[PDB]
Structure 1
Amino acid sequence: CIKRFTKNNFFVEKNPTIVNFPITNVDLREYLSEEVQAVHKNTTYDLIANIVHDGKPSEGSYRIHVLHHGTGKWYELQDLQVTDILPQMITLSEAYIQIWKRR
């Protein structure tokens, strides 16, 4: 989960900081103690679903990037939208909630 929406001292705003994140290769082994690192032989995760938000908190429209397993077609769904996007539009947009898989 990504903390975009936060309240200031006066009014709630959003943090529109884009993130450059891979989708099929990431290593997380540095974040575990070695006395536990030996248990896990799989610390690599692949993105599955992505949540992107639009505009202000009071006027938002969620969009979803889903990965069809087996294939690699990343599809964009807002209400009924269907569009096989490329693995770069996932990076360009600002993510809000990401789903992974340790494989």
Structure 2
Amino acid sequence: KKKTIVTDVFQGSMRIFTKKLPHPDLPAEEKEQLLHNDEYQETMVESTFMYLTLDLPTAPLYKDEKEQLIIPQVPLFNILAKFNGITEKEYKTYKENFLKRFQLTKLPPYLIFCIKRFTKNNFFVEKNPTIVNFPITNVDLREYLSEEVQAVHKNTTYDLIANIVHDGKPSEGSYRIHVLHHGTGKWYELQDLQVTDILPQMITLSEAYIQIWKRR
């Protein structure tokens, strides 16, 4: 069926502007003529996404000069700066680089974010520990929709409902989960048999992995 329950709960419509990139070690005139050859031009592709993959920015890799060894923290809006025409993403495919820039079209009633951890480097797999700072109360996503599709949408405010955190190295980690109780508004963190009440204040103080948001 075109619209199953999972489709109407999580699936959304999103738009990719894929532009082929010539080899960077090419003459400027040759690069320009290849761009004019209609092969390295932008193409629009619509697609359906069950979730949005959030690419964490690069770690500092060096101690902070003033307050040494500070864990990096990124606002949620910088990660959300994706999915718009202003920001691109040079995908470094082993064959050739691609200039793909995304753009949201139709937000799902419920949103799933997956923060990309456990990225395999050239020799092994390491976990990015960068923490994302987000307003748990509400977020605004109307600013990340094109002007054509903002007329249909009326509810773009999202509130955090579920949070997943991975604690430890990728080799051996623990998956903890915070859930928002609709009846009381309280956040409860449960790990295996352990169940505890957690204040919403330190929800963002963890390595968020999967976020479930409700448009209300």
- Taking structure 2 as the reference length, the TM-score comes to 0.47
- Secondary structure, aligned partner of 2:155: coil
Q: Partners of 1:55 and 1:98 in 2: how far apart?
A: 19
Q: Partners of 1:80 and 1:37 in 2: how far apart?
A: 44
Answer 1 or 2: which has greater strand percent.
Answer: 2
Q: How many residues align?
A: 103
Structure 2 unaligned regions, length at least 5:
1-113
Q: 1:92: Cα distance to partner?
A: 0.8
Q: 1:3: Cα distance to partner?
A: 0.4
Deviating above 4 A after TM superposition, structure 1's stretches of 4 or more consecutive aligned residues are none
Q: 1:94: Cα distance to partner?
A: 1.5
Larger Rg: 2
Alignment of 1:22-101 (within 5 A): 22-101=135-214
RMSD: 0.8
Which has the larger displacement, 39-48 or 21-30?
21-30
- Secondary structure, aligned partner of 1:84: strand
The structure showing larger relative contact order (alpha-carbon pairs under 8 Å, at least 6 residues apart) is 1
Structure 1 unaligned regions, length at least 5:
none
Q: 1:24: Cα distance to partner?
A: 1.9
- Taking structure 1 as the reference length, the TM-score comes to 0.95
Q: Partners of 1:22 and 1:81 in 2: how far apart?
A: 26
- The percent identity for this pair of structures is 100
Q: 1:83: Cα distance to partner?
A: 1.2
Q: 1:96: Cα distance to partner?
A: 0.3
Cα distance per residue 1:42-71 (max 9 Å; x no partner): 000010110000111110110000111121
